From a paper:
As described in detail elsewhere, we discovered that anthranilic acids bind the ANS allosteric pocket of [name] using a combination of high-throughput and virtual screening. The first compound crystallized of this series was 1, which binds [name] with low micromolar affinity as measured by isothermal titration calorimetry (ITC) and by surface plasmon resonance (SPR) using the steady-state approximation (SSA) affinity fit. The carboxylic acid of 1 forms a charge-charge interaction with the side chain of the catalytic residue K33 in the hydrophobic interior of the protein, the same residue that engages the sulfonic acid in ANS. Due to the strength of this type of interaction in a nonpolar environment, it is likely crucial for the binding of these allosteric inhibitors. In addition, the carboxylic acid is held in place through polar interaction with the backbone N-H of F146 of the DFG motif. The N-H of the indole forms a hydrogen bond interaction with the backbone carbonyl of L58 of the C-helix, and the remainder of the binding interaction seem to be driven by van der Waals forces in a pocket largely composed of hydrophobic residues. Both 1 and ANS are amphipathic in nature, with a negatively charged moiety driving the binding to K33 and much of the remaining structure engaging with the hydrophobic pocket. Further analysis of the crystal structure of 1 bound to [name] reveals that the allosteric inhibitor engages with L53 and L58 of the C-helix, potentially in a manner incompatible with cyclin A binding that would require a reorientation of the C-helix. The allosteric [name] inhibitors in this work stabilize [name] in a unique inactive conformation, as demonstrated by X-ray crystallography.
[name] is a member of the CDK family of kinases that control the cell cycle and is activated by binding E-type cyclins at the G1-S transition, then by A-type cyclins in S phase. In addition, [name] must be phosphorylated on the activation loop to become fully activated. [name] also plays a critical role in meiosis since [name]−/− mice are sterile but otherwise healthy, making [name] a validated target for non-hormonal contraceptive development. In this paper, we describe the development and mechanism of action of type III inhibitors that bind [name] with nanomolar affinity.
Residue numbers in the entry: 0 to 298
The structure:
Amino acid sequence: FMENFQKVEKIGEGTYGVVYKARNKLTGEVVALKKIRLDTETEGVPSTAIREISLLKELNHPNIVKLLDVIHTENKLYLVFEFLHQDLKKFMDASALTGIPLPLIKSYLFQLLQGLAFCHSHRVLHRDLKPQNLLINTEGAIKLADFGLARAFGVPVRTYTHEVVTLWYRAPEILLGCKYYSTAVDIWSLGCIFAEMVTRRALFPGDSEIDQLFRIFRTLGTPDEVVWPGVTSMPDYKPSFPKWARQDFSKVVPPLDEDGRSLLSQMLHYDPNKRISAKAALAHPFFQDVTKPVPHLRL
Ligand SMILES: O=C(O)c1cc([N+](=O)[O-])ccc1NCCc1c[nH]c2ccccc12
């Protein structure tokens, strides 16, 4: 019975929903309740969208948030998830003056690659990975959450006429107007998050589509047909883009050893077709000495 649960506090704000911590007034059980408003007051959610969401209840992995229940009405979609206390953004901020320790960076990266390898094998993308979307617990786990699946599945989410989007983790093929996404978009985002854990600063904090593109280009070099065959045929490519030279990855994430820099370079490959897959990245030598430390969380 999903009304013995009462809202305790607002957890966060997604791109189309607000999330609450909800507590069972008799058992104490706590869940995360995501409420997504729709663009309609009467028409509800299409059955085909509910079909696709509901299948994810039975596709489970330790590094993906668990979807517990799907509830829909004439004007709202509610998704009930397992609750975790903290996220990677908050943990980064607490660790910012010192740095998340390397063994924990490596463990979190490995786990997130395991989660992506799973969803990608089931033909599901995340599409909007950001540190605030990665949930952590006292036991050393990290989990993919806040998947960007509402529009992909046809949920008629409310349109926000003045929406402010964070573009910092967006793959360059999206910014250049690619008509079809691939699983490689999530590897790019995760590479950006990897670099952010190491350097304690977002890698490409752009403030518009062109500023995001130009920040990538000023670091990795303006892409051309040599490094990204097909780039000049992307819908938003402009031959008039300024031509910046590529910076060495030794300058991009300096403290990182050559094993880590090599993996990062494969995660940030311009061509999505040659960007490393999550499954291949799990075999990279950077992970030879991976362990599972626990963070010190102050809850
Ligand atoms: O996280 C969200 O907010 C979210 C939003 C919508 N939506 O709005 O349509 C739909 C699904 C969502 N999460 C699914 C989490 C999930 C469980 N098992 C999986 C297996 C593979 C890939 C993903 C998952």
